[PDB]
């Protein structure tokens, strides 16, 4: 999750 999140935004 942290990571999928920290490349969406
Ligand atoms: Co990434």
Same mark, same amino acid.
């Given at each position: =999750? #942290?990571?999928?999140?920290?490349? #969406? =935004?």
């Amino acid at each position: =999750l #942290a990571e999928a999140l920290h490349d #969406a =935004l």
